[PDB]
């Protein structure tokens, strides 16, 4: 169930939520790309979505490897090893 | 007409309806079953789309194999033995 | 650009529209049928829409053969004979 | 990541934006066309999406072969030669 790339074109942290979910008996290993208007893409930020359970990740929780600064519109890519779903909230 | 595997990867009730429409000559027979971000997924919850019907399923409503706990993120995934159209209000 | 297939499994007309986009060389030749949850499906509803132009229709304008009653959900298949593009507003 | 050919039903400017990525190592060229409900189209619309960048691109601003009318429905269709994902804001 689901895909292993999904893109969302638009995002922003006012000075911002994937819902993913792992309906597979495989824990998935994400890994998402942070893109801008003017620098180079940022990452791969790296996280565990454990079998059969839903995470939600917020891009404002994300620090490693940095930050994303507020008021900045951004895309990501979220590539998985497993099939997954994600919605953006 | 659609597809026989639906996931919809937010789901929440307030302490939530899927618009099902079977466009075909035979009845389907649909399979939901609720994830969670911290226990093991329930169901199959059951239930029948009569040929050339819609139906809406309030995730609210639904009992068996257990109520949906309220005030909880979840998603879901909805089978099919036939194709249908989902659509999440 | 498109296809010749589109569904949308919730439609409402308060006591309502798709917007179709037809970017091809041939005039799309495009059959409406409405489903209920409780009734057999009323169709087809035919109309045109022209080589490389947009056509908004009004689910309330329908009338042949039949009018949509109105404070009653309803879902729409919509059929062509060449791909078009459908956004429901 | 994304797709050579992007299309937007109902697109509008009040008397309007595309969010792109190119996720890509190679730069967007970028080919956007509007259609009307009783006119020919007009396009293409040129731009570069870089490697690796977003870009929003608003209806209001495009000018070359002519400015959009406002209060006006339209659709567009948004080509490229190397994939890209758009989002319709």
Redesign the interface.
């Known amino acids: 169930?689901?895909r292993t790339?999904w893109?969302?074109?638009?995002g922003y942290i006012p000075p911002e939520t994937v819902?993913?979910?792992n309906?597979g008996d495989e824990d998935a290993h994400v890994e998402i790309?942070i893109?801008?208007?003017?620098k180079?893409?940022v990452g791969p930020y790296r996280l565990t979505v454990p079998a059969?359970?839903?995470?939600?990740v917020r891009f404002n929780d994300l620090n490693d490897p940095a930050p994303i600064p507020h008021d900045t519109?951004?895309?990501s890519?979220i590539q998985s090893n497993v099939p997954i779903?994600?919605?953006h909230?």
């Open positions: 169930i689901g790339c893109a969302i074109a638009e819902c993913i979910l309906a790309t893109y801008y208007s003017d180079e893409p059969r359970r839903t995470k939600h519109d951004f895309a890519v779903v994600v919605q909230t």
